[PDB]
């Protein structure tokens, strides 16, 4: 049982082996689920791997895991679009994603950049709710 974990460290030392390792982690995943987050920090074989990372993010209520999952998805334009969609669907917080898109949307020449910037500004803009 321990041997599989030992093998995983060997896989960690190192594509198919990555599949065996990711399967070894997804076999269920506590701190290990966060570690998959490390896999998102490193590499994702396919949207499916990214989807699994997203599932882990969904599983943990706290915000950072979800942010990491979104990042994994991006790593270009399609990934950025997916991140934007997630932000639109996500009502959790505007700060982590705010800065992300800012630097992410600095590789665009025209229209969408000015228009995109305007859209970002629009998104940014009892008691507190009334204000």
């Amino acid at each position: 049982v321990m041997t599989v974990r030992d093998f995983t460290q060997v896989f960690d030392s190192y594509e198919e082996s990555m599949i065996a390792a990711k399967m070894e982690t997804a076999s269920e995943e506590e701190e290990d689920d966060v570690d998959l987050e490390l896999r998102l920090a490193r590499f994702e074989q396919l949207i499916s791997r990214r989807p699994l990372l997203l599932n882990s993010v969904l599983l943990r209520q706290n915000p950072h895991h979800v942010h990491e999952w979104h990042k994994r998805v991006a790593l270009g334009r399609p990934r950025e679009i997916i991140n934007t969609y997630t932000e639109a669907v996500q009502t959790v917080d505007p700060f982590k994603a705010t800065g992300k898109p800012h630097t992410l949307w600095v590789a665009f020449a025209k229209f969408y950049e000015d228009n995109g910037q305007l859209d970002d500004a629009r998104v940014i803009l009892k008691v507190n709710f009334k204000q």
């Binding site: 997916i82 969609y85 229209f111 969408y112 859209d119």
Partner: peptide, 8 residues
């Protein structure tokens, strides 16, 4: 509308 993200 054109200024929109392609994915969105």
């Amino acid at each position: 509308f054109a200024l929109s993200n392609v994915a969105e």
